């Protein structure tokens, strides 16, 4: 099973430094050219750096002189040393494998390329703002909930920094009819988000509803029970 797992992403001060790492498995790491590609929220893909099998490196102007890509084949690892960080560096950073394909038809023969394997990504935030844990409030189901109909309930995850937060319902048992909204930046610079779920009105009395909120950047794990008021 081919996989790439990134780590080291976190909140850093402007002008600060951070080292990203990528753990490769399920393939001969040493035989592949590798890349780091970044993407700011709601924005396009941006190539950060390339490294060949011989350790030869390439960088765009946006990042050259501040970032260093490196590889440790004995540890099947890819690294990204990022220095003199700025707001423009805030993004999800992906560890990417370069695939090689041989076009062999005649006359003529050549190699083609593709970014065939990408990791899940690691979030980098460059800001002087403090790490802040969220407050978790219930979105209590209405008493007017139609008999034999559908009722809505949820959790409001307010005032946290940086991203991300994860929300599950009933420890991952309740997934159907769930809507976890993308975080919105409030005027204060803090994030806020709601996670909702629609369930039958009958279950409101019998079934217990708990939202499992996890904000790893602030070490905030909260389980909030949502019940009719």
């Amino acid at each position: 099973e081919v996989q790439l797992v990134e780590s080291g992403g976190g909140l850093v001060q402007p002008g600060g430094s951070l080292r990203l790492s990528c753990a490769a498995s399920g393939f001969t790491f040493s035989s592949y050219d590798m890349h780091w590609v970044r993407q700011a929220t709601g924005k396009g893909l941006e190539w950060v750096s390339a490294i060949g099998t011989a350790g030869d490196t390439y960088y765009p102007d946006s990042v050259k002189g501040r970032f260093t890509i490196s590889r440790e084949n004995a540890k099947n690892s890819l690294y990204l040393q990022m220095n003199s960080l700025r707001a423009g560096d805030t993004a999800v950073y992906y560890c990417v494998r370069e695939g090689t394909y041989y076009h062999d038809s005649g006359s003529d023969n050549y190699y083609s390329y593709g970014m065939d394997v990408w990791g899940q990504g690691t979030t980098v935030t460059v800001s002087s703002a403090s790490t802040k844990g969220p407050s978790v409030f219930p979105l209590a189901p209405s008493s007017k909930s139609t008999s034999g109909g559908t009722a809505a309930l949820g959790c409001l995850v307010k005032d946290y920094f940086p991203e991300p937060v994860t929300v599950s319902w009933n420890s991952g048992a309740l997934t159907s009819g769930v809507h976890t909204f993308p975080a919105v930046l409030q005027s204060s610079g803090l994030y806020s988000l709601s996670s909702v779920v629609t369930v039958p009105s009958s279950s409101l009395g019998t079934q217990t509803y708990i939202c499992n909120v996890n904000h790893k950047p602030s070490n905030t794990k909260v389980d909030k029970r949502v019940e009719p008021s």
Binding site: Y58, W118, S194
Partner: protein, 213 residues
């Protein structure tokens, strides 16, 4: 540096439709162009390499064509799960570049939202702030007007919206609208109403509650 321009920036198409996405290179790049599919919250997936070669595991409905400076991505028969942001990328230069992306929405039958209003919790009120949430659940098209009214006075600049990405199966959106007020301003008023205007509704729907009741 090779600049890649995609067209259109966005498009909306029905299930069964043939979709074409263009990628124009600022300089000749031969066939050194790859196409990617990016689903929300996920890393991009390679679809096509060498401008026309179909990557392993990619359905045949995806195809690539072109050489030199003009390239095309074709999706022959749209499926609901085809909604994504599509990107072209070149391997001509060591300095890799990507196009800006093309957001593809799946056209669907009109579906009215289910509306729910949520009063602030007693726990939040103790902190000196009141968040009032309005939920628009499973609707299509995306266009929706959400207006907040407090004692029938239209609110402005004190609400923020969040919208989910198209549901991969039913192709619907869900929307949250949050009204933020101080505890003192919230306690000043009785009627909290969220009014929703949408194509699937025969007239605007209002969900309301009376503070305390």
């Amino acid at each position: 540096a090779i600049q890649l321009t995609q067209s259109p920036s966005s498009l909306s198409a029905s299930v069964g439709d043939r979709v074409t996405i263009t990628c124009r290179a600022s300089q000749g790049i031969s066939s050194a162009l790859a196409w990617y599919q990016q689903k929300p919250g996920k890393a991009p997936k390679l679809l096509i390499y060498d401008a026309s070669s179909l990557e392993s595991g990619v359905p045949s409905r995806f195809s690539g064509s072109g050489s030199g400076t003009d390239f095309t991505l074709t999706i022959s028969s749209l499926q609901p799960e085809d909604f994504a942001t599509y990107y072209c990328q070149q391997f001509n230069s060591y300095l890799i570049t990507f196009g800006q992306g093309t957001r593809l929405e799946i056209k669907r039958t009109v579906a009215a939202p289910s509306v729910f209003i949520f009063p602030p919790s007693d726990e939040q009120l103790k902190s000196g702030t009141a968040s009032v949430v309005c939920l628009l659940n499973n609707f299509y098209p995306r266009e929706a007007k959400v207006q907040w009214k407090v004692d029938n006075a239209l609110q402005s600049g004190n609400s923020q919206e969040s919208v989910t990405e198209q549901d991969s199966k039913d192709s619907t959106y869900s929307l949250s609208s949050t009204l933020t007020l101080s505890k003192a301003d919230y306690e000043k008023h009785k009627v909290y109403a969220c009014e929703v205007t949408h194509q699937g509704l025969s007239s605007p729907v209002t969900k309301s509650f009376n503070r305390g009741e």
